Design a protein around this ligand. Structure first.
Ligand code: HEM
Length: 484
């Protein structure tokens, strides 16, 4: 049955358009006042229908050569398990990660941290060690528009007054990068290229974009394997994973410079560039190394019709890492034919996620470049959606990125594959974490000598400093369960 796009929060299907975004993390201090205030908040929430209407209007204005308006910033809302509990909404949503919460789950994710008995505390900024009940987030074109809309929302809940119904835990801000690199993450790689197409939503999937059933993103829609276990109010909500991911840019650049791929005919500079590309799975431009393994192709990169049409063929069963290491980030996070082809012919639609990241922080300074060391915080406000954190984000992190034997272990489960004997892909070098913070390695980066590993520097390139798992309910869920 068609999706009710008026009922779905707009960041899930569509995505809030932005140059800047604020995430406001709160605790509920007076439940019944919160629910009364929620009634006034709900009409401000951007829906998926709204996303489409707004984007068509901006396009039409541009075609008509009308000057642009100040767009109102857009707002969405999401609640943690702790917040559901505080509100007396006690239905089990059938996601172990969400229910556990990210502060405890971060031990298994591999985050740095310490233990006192069985109690793990991740090495996070202080506010993310507190119980967080929800997030209100506001996206827009400039700081003024976001701040105006956020102040209006805060006013609804009486924030900072003696009649508040919530309190600020903390807030974080994202900002796209300057100029032509605005959609490049801070390591320099174009981000946001590959997402699953969603049946009943994406009417014209791109070449190479296999569409998946909407229930892999939205609870209780077609394809949600847990639909019968979940409460009716959960229909058309999605699980929002937030990760506050600091990046160590100069350190990564130093790594690459210190480990150029030695290949006949390449200079040190070109070998270092190729290494970066091979660790990610794309050149900085976005061109996929599977299509262009020897050198960048900026024209390919810029063409959405071509830049994602690859599946890794049968390179895994052949043991062939010449075009792309097995442990490249994109391959660790969306395996394509590594799992979907023979021997497994696996259905990994439940491993798909929709990402809505935005960068944070200033550009690398001259002193940082000279020093080859980070002096300022910068990174990614990682956000992804799916109908199961257990199947998606958590699984990806623990079972794929953190698993040095993946994807060899998965395919040799089915039968012996002699070209894979002894092959140990290693960690995803962007996000892979080793519990206890020990030695990580990555193999397959030199196309001529796949067996050689690089042992990564002990400072991980990405450092998590906070996070939580939330559920973004539908508009009718908010009206009926969250409001009076
Ligand atoms: C600072 C941290 C991160 C950086 C710098 C980063 C960077 C990138 C880049 C450059 C791409 C390729 C272009 C694209 O398809 O968008 C990408 C793809 C992707 N990443 Fe990340 N990433 C980060 C964190 C994460 C995390 C934490 C996860 C999941 C646990 C994740 C999952 C994905 C997925 C699913 C894709 C798409 C793969 C595909 O469909 O080909 N990434 N990442």
């Amino acid at each position: 049955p068609p999706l009710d796009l008026n009922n779905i929060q707009g960041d899930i299907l569509g995505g809030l358009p932005k140059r800047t975004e604020t995430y406001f993390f709160f605790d509920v201090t007076n439940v019944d006042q919160f629910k009364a205030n929620m009634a006034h908040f709900i009409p401000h929430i951007k829906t998926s229908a709204g996303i489409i209407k707004d984007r068509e209007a901006i396009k039409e204005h541009k075609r008509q050569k009308k000057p642009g308006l100040v767009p109102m910033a857009a707002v969405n809302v999401s609640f943690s398990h702790l917040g559901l509990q505080k509100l007396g909404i006690t239905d089990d949503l059938s996601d172990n990660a969400f229910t556990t919460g990210q502060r405890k789950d971060a031990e298994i994710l591999g985050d740095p941290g310490s233990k006192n008995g069985d109690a793990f505390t991740p090495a996070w900024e202080a506010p993310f060690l507190k119980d967080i009940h929800g997030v209100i987030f506001v996206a827009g074109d400039c700081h003024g528009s976001v701040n105006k809309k956020l102040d209006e929302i805060k006013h609804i809940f009486g924030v900072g007054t003696s009649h508040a119904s919530i309190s600020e835990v903390t807030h974080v801000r994202g900002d796209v990068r300057p100029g032509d690199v605005h959609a490049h993450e801070h390591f320099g790689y174009l981000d946001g290229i590959s997402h699953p197409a969603v049946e009943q939503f994406d009417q014209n999937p791109l070449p190479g974009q296999d569409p998946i059933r909407p229930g892999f993103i939205l609870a209780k829609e077609n394809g949600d394997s847990r639909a019968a276990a979940r409460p009716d109010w959960a229909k058309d909500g999605s699980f929002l994973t937030f990760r506050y991911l600091f990046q160590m840019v100069p350190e990564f650049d130093d790594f690459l410079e210190s480990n150029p791929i030695v290949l006949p005919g390449l200079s040190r500079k070109e070998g270092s560039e190729l290494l970066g590309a091979r660790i990610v799975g794309r050149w900085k431009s976005g061109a996929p190394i599977e299509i262009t393994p020897l050198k960048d192709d900026p024209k390919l990169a810029a063409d959405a019709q071509r830049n994602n049409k690859f599946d890794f063929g049968d390179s895994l069963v052949r043991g062939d890492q010449t075009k792309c290491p097995f442990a490249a980030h994109i391959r660790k996070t969306y395996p394509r034919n590594d799992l979907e082809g023979p021997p497994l012919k696996a259905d990994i639609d439940n491993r798909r996620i929709i990402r809505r990241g935005i960068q944070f922080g200033p550009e690398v300074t001259s002193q940082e470049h000279h020093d080859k060391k980070t002096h300022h915080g910068r990174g990614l406000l990682f956000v992804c959606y799916s109908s199961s954190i257990d199947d998606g984000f958590h699984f990806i992190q623990e079972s794929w990125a953190n698993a040095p034997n993946f994807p060899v272990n998965a395919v040799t489960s089915a039968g012996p594959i002699p070209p894979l004997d002894g092959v140990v892909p290693g960690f995803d070098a962007i996000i892979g974490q080793k519990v206890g913070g020990g030695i990580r390695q990555i193999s397959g980066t030199n196309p001529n000598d796949p067996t050689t590993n690089i042992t990564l520097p002990d400072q991980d390139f990405v450092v998590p400093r906070g996070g939580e798992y939330f559920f973004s309910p539908s508009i009718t869920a908010l009206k009926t369960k969250f409001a009076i």
